[PDB]
Amino acid sequence: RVGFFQLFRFSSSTDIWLMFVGSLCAFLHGIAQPGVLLIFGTMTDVFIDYDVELQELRCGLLNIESEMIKFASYYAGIAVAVLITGYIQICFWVIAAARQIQKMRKFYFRRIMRMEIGWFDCNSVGELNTRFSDDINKINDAIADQMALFIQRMTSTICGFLLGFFRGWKLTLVIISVSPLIGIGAATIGLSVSKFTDYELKAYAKAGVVADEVISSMRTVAAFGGEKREVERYEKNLVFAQRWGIRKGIVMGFFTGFVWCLIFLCYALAFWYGSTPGTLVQIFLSVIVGALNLGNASPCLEAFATGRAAATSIFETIDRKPIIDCMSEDGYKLDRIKGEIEFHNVTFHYPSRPEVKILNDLNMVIKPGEMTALVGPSGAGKSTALQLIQRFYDPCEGMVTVDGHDIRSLNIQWLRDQIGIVEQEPVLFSTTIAENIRYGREDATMEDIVQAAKEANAYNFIMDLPQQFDTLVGEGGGQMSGGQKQRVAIARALIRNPKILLLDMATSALDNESEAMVQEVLSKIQHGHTIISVAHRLSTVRAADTIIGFEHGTAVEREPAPVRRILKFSAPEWPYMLVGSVGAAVNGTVTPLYAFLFSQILGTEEQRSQINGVCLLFVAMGCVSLFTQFLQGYAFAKSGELLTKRLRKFGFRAMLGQDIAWFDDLRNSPGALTTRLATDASQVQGAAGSQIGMIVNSFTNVTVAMIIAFSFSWKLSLVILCFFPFLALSGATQTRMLTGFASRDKQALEMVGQITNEALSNIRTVAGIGKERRFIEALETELEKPFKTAIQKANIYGFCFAFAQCIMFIANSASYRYGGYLISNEGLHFSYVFRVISAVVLSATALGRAFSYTPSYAKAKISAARFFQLLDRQPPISVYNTAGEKWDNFQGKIDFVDCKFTYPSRPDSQVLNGLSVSISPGQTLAFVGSSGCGKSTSIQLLERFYDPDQGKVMIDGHDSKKVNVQFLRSNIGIVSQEPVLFACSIMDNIKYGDNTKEIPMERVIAAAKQAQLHDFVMSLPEKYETNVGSQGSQLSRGEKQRIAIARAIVRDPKILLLDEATSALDTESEKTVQVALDKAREGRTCIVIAHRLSTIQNADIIAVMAQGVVIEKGTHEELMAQKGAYYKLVTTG
Ligand SMILES: Nc1ncnc2c1ncn2[C@@H]1O[C@H](COP(=O)(O)OP(=O)(O)OP(=O)(O)O)[C@@H](O)[C@H]1O
Ligand SMILES: CC(C)CCC[C@@H](C)[C@H]1CC[C@H]2[C@@H]3CC=C4C[C@@H](O)CC[C@]4(C)[C@H]3CC[C@]12C
Ligand SMILES: CC(C)CCC[C@@H](C)[C@H]1CC[C@H]2[C@@H]3CC=C4C[C@@H](O)CC[C@]4(C)[C@H]3CC[C@]12C
Ligand SMILES: CC(C)CCC[C@@H](C)[C@H]1CC[C@H]2[C@@H]3CC=C4C[C@@H](O)CC[C@]4(C)[C@H]3CC[C@]12C
Ligand SMILES: CC(C)CCC[C@@H](C)[C@H]1CC[C@H]2[C@@H]3CC=C4C[C@@H](O)CC[C@]4(C)[C@H]3CC[C@]12C
Ligand SMILES: Nc1ncnc2c1ncn2[C@@H]1O[C@H](COP(=O)(O)OP(=O)(O)O)[C@@H](O)[C@H]1O
Ligand code: VO4
Ligand SMILES: [Mg+2]
Ligand SMILES: [Mg+2]
């Protein structure tokens, strides 16, 4: 745990001043209650003197009406002071914490974006997102207003017992004798809670990785039907976190019960050993003041310990010093850079797998102003060489040089500025195309972007879009074709006009014609550029000034009722709310009942009967409180824990059942959904935990107090009851102004999560373009939006909290004035009635602090409304729907009958302008065409990700809209265009091919052998159990593709869909994979999409697609005889 006073590292002078003033006001508000104790003690002696003079009837000197007019004036002054002090106390403390938390978040995100690339290989994005969302929120909970409330309660407790020292002495000695026992207990309990919080936070962080990966790879999850297992993993992570919250609630519910018992038993000990009426009453009331105000301090200690744990978690990251510092200025920068790069005996190991030597004494020379082609098998280390030039890592031994200068002695920012890179399988950011291209150079005008698109061969298809250059590419570029994404990435790298170009397979997803068009300009710009391209095409390899071959590391040349819904939702927790409510009601009854009883025991001496009766009352009120406070604090915490895990599980389950179109909406980005999952459950828990116990306690206390008050004098009680409707008005008015704020803040909070996930998951791309500052500024500019509303919520909360206590004290002032009227004018023996009524009303003053539960009530209502809006949605394509046609014998016959389709996110241009094709069972169809003509769109129709608008897709003579989604998907095996893996072992990534059953390892090994993958996995430490990293990023692209092929093959599907399954492989491995795939596609229907036309000549049918329409259809020989578009496509390549 961190030091508690170390939570204020970010506090400035203004924060210190605010804390000082708020603490002074809290101290005054705390001493306000011993003042009312003194006033109550003074009135009793006056009554005793008046009663004795009446019953003896110094006569006529004292008049009760004037005396209690003075007392009412005292109470009114106390009310005004309490209003002022409470408002300032809450407002200043809430404002001070907000600035510190904002600085903490900005520092956290600014430090995270500075770490070296190797740091992210060991630290998941989901864990960082969960930290940023929830741990800083817990730190805020620790230091916002629980600190002010704890200061006030401690002041009241101290002044309550210190009053018994300065007056009515010889009884506080026993309290001093036991005070270390309270202090020692609260320290050990605080230690226990922090340790529990560490496990809770770790389990919650592990739960956020699963959700993030599933939401990012929903398309893969939906294709293989793994929603059930992903929900199971999420529940497994959540159950561990829920179990520790229960123990935290237990240990914090024992603390509250221990305090009451100890105080009351210690006073019972003090009274029995021992042996004016206005001193006994003060002592009796100080007992309950101390016990009640120590009991209510329990929520603050738990908040402090939770904040300490979250703070050590957050603070470890901020104080870390990165090995490779990009924003630092300790480096040299050259002038007139030639661009020559040289490797000198470079040996490299990856920090995640240090037992494997990726580069072994590698030596190359890359002459400036020439084209160098890196060729080699998958896994030879071609991608690692470029990352070393980028200085993402450093060689274990050896030296990388530019123009003869060591890479380690150069300014990092300048070096990465001089480099433009097209990463293998590029990634774009969620914005318009123009902004994505302008991410390279922010000083680029519109004509610069137009020229960049012209060189990237992107101008034509961009201008053929409904929103030219302003089309939204989507999350990661998902709402684009692979070739379009690649060409936009090429335009991004070319707009910088760099000296060094690193094209890692920059034409992988392009057809022959567009690849030739790109390569023409690439060969044209050679005089002023140093170009290094990883390539597989023979045409790319030729016309290259230098060819360098890689082999194993060596290189050689050549909604409407949120509360009612949650009340119906929390039904299975009735037993725990029943016992908790009983405990809270018993707790609320004793506080005014105690005041009533000690008035009876005092009445108006004896060692035998009076002392014993007082002592037994203390023992009973100690033991019963010990049990019932524990019951309340444990049962309500358990109910909250159960409710929040059910909320989280059901939200995750409901998210997975939505259609793919839902996941494509810009309001449903993966970051936003993860932020929804992480935060909306905690907010409902905050209102749904022990706060219901507090509310029940307060309501029962007030009800019992007024019940006893009405049974003595209904005339006086009506005055006090009349003030209560003011409490309902202010509380309802508080939530009314706060729900409007909570609606506007959640949108900003969700959009902040979008920025964090986008930047942290694409850190390699961000470092490649070198736009860390851009994302920092974007996150900062969106973090300020709730910050302006924070001060207004602080003012509203402070005013309502102060006004509640002000009304409580004004009620007593009015009651005193009315009693002054009543006793003098029309009253006999009424002095005792007013005494007991004032006693019970006085003792029912403090528990009206349930107004501090309210400021989170506005948040919980919005969170519940949003949770129930999603839980009720009915997707057009329901994977959870059990209704649909399911026939026994599946044959894999596919028919397209005049299919017309438009993407919902882009409804101004349809991508399938009538598509008619038929594949007989056992045949193979090869889809060929230009980049972006709709080949992948047709595949998504078969998987039922989308439904055709006009037309139908027929499977075995059945319309696809009437076929069961699960049944249809269980018979299809798909290799996506750029496949994504899960952060697990290789065996688990292969075993995902067939969920709902356990695949034996023999079948996994056979599938891996088929995909030409067994030798690579065998040559690794931890064979078949190596973690592949996030999205399979700790592997080469070819190995990831081969794992995907094995995953598709292992399930043995009736229909096999391959969407460019060799785009990352080299020719030598491609031939072996094709030979193995021929057996895979020998007894089943298959659809093949390929820009490599050497792998489709064996296909039964070759259909050429153009703008969503088939133009030619036939075999290889027939299509070459026609000299059509297929012949041109083959010839140009
Ligand atoms: N971040 C990483 N952590 C650990 N190992 C990695 C990481 N990135 C790559 N590797 C490993 O380094 C080796 C070299 O693969 P590399 O990524 O350099 O591909 P490549 O040889 O250029 O091939 P391809 O054509 O498939 O991209 C592989 O064994 C790969 O698993
Ligand atoms: C009136 C009595 C009873 C209570 C007074 C409490 C006040 C004076 C206390 C409570 C919280 C305290 C602050 C807590 C944190 C900070 C930041 C730290 O880096 C230095 C100390 C400093 C600046 C403290 C100054 C004193 C402080 C403001
Ligand atoms: C404007 C605000 C700050 C005024 C607040 C005044 C209050 C807090 C002060 C001012 C006068 C004070 C009272 C003056 C005299 C008596 C009688 C004495 O035997 C017991 C204390 C008692 C009952 C005092 C209690 C506290 C008191 C009521
Ligand atoms: C609108 C809601 C908040 C009701 C407000 C009632 C307030 C304003 C009223 C109710 C009882 C009133 C008090 C009753 C008796 C006296 C004694 C007199 O010698 C001085 C004024 C003083 C102390 C009054 C001040 C105003 C008072 C406190
Ligand atoms: C079910 C439990 C929790 C209910 C507890 C309510 C208790 C504290 C209340 C409810 C009704 C109350 C009684 C109402 C009327 C009378 C008569 C009066 O001359 C003295 C007080 C006395 C005797 C009250 C004592 C306290 C009392 C019994
Ligand atoms: N989810 C989507 N939302 C909107 N437009 C999309 C989406 N996916 C693809 N597109 C666009 O619609 C067209 C469909 O082409 P696509 O199927 O991606 O091409 P290809 O035939 O190369 O696989 C392209 O213009 C592409 O940019
Ligand atoms: O390279 V494509 O636009 O046919 O996925
Ligand atoms: Mg590579
Ligand atoms: Mg595609």
UniProtKB/Swiss-Prot annotation:
Residues 1127-1130 are annotated as: Mediates internalization from the plasma membrane. Residues 99-145, 192-249, 296-577, 632-685, 728-795, 849-1133 are cytoplasmic. Keywords: ATP-binding, Cell membrane, Disease variant, Endosome, Glycoprotein, Intrahepatic cholestasis, Lipid transport, Membrane, Nucleotide-binding, Phosphoprotein, Repeat, Translocase, Transmembrane, Transmembrane helix, Transport, Ubl conjugation. The uptake of taurocholate is inhibited by taurolithocholate sulfate with an IC(50) of 9 uM. Pravastatin competitively inhibits the transport of taurocholic acid. Cyclosporin A, glibenclamide, rifampicin and troglitazonestrongly competitively inhibit the transport activity of taurocholate. The canalicular transport activity of taurocholate is strongly dependent on canalicular membrane cholesterol content. The uptake of taurocholate is increased by short- and medium-chain fatty acids. Cholesterol increases transport capacity of taurocholate without affecting the affinity for the substrate. ATP 2 binds at G929, S930, S931, G932, C933, G934, K935, S936. Residues 341-558, 894-1132 form the ABC transporter domain. GO terms for cellular component: apical plasma membrane; cell surface; endosome; extracellular exosome; intercellular canaliculus; intracellular canaliculus; plasma membrane; recycling endosome. The modification Phosphoserine is found at S508, S1030. The keyword Repeat applies. Residues 19-306, 577-859 form the ABC transmembrane type-1 domain. The chain crosses the membrane at residues 20-40, 78-98, 146-166, 171-191, 250-270, 276-295, 578-598, 611-631, 686-706, 707-727, 796-816, 828-848. Changing Y1127A: Loss of interaction with AP2A1 and AP2A2. Promotes ABCB11 plasma membrane trafficking. Does not affect plasma membrane localization. Inhibits ABCB11 internalization. Expressed predominantly, if not exclusively in the liver, where it was further localized to the canalicular microvilli and to subcanalicular vesicles of the hepatocytes by in situ. It catalyses: cholate(in) + ATP + H2O = cholate(out) + ADP + phosphate + H(+); taurocholate(in) + ATP + H2O = taurocholate(out) + ADP + phosphate + H(+); glycocholate(in) + ATP + H2O = glycocholate(out) + ADP + phosphate + H(+); glycochenodeoxycholate(in) + ATP + H2O = glycochenodeoxycholate(out) + ADP + phosphate + H(+). InterPro entries: AAA+_ATPase (IPR003593), ABC1_TM_dom (IPR011527), ABC1_TM_sf (IPR036640), ABC_transporter-like_ATP-bd (IPR003439), ABC_transporter-like_CS (IPR017871), P-loop_NTPase (IPR027417), Type_1_exporter (IPR039421). It is found in: Apical cell membrane; Recycling endosome membrane; Endosome; Cell membrane. Its main location: membrane. It is a multi-pass membrane protein. CDD domains: ABC_6TM_Pgp_ABCB1_D1_like, ABC_6TM_Pgp_ABCB1_D2_like, ABC_MTABC3_MDL1_MDL2. Belongs to the ABC transporter superfamily. ABCB family. Multidrug resistance exporter (TC 3.A.1.201) subfamily. Catalyzes the transport of the major hydrophobic bile salts, such as taurine and glycine-conjugated cholic acid across the canalicular membrane of hepatocytes in an ATP-dependent manner, therefore participates in hepatic bile acid homeostasis and consequently to lipid homeostasis through regulation of biliary lipid secretion in a bile salts dependent manner. Transports taurine-conjugated bile salts more rapidly than glycine-conjugated bile salts. Multifunctional polypeptide with two homologous halves, each containing a hydrophobic membrane-anchoring domain and an ATP binding cassette (ABC) domain. It is linked to Cholestasis, progressive familial intrahepatic, 2: A disorder characterized by early onset of cholestasis that progresses to hepatic fibrosis, cirrhosis, and end-stage liver disease before adulthood. PFIC2 inheritance is autosomal recessive. Interacts with HAX1. Interacts with the adapter protein complex 2 (AP-2) throught AP2A2 or AP2A1; this interaction regulates cell membrane expression of ABCB11 through its internalization in a clathrin-dependent manner and its subsequent degradation. This is Bile salt export pump. It comes from Homo sapiens. The gene is ABCB11.
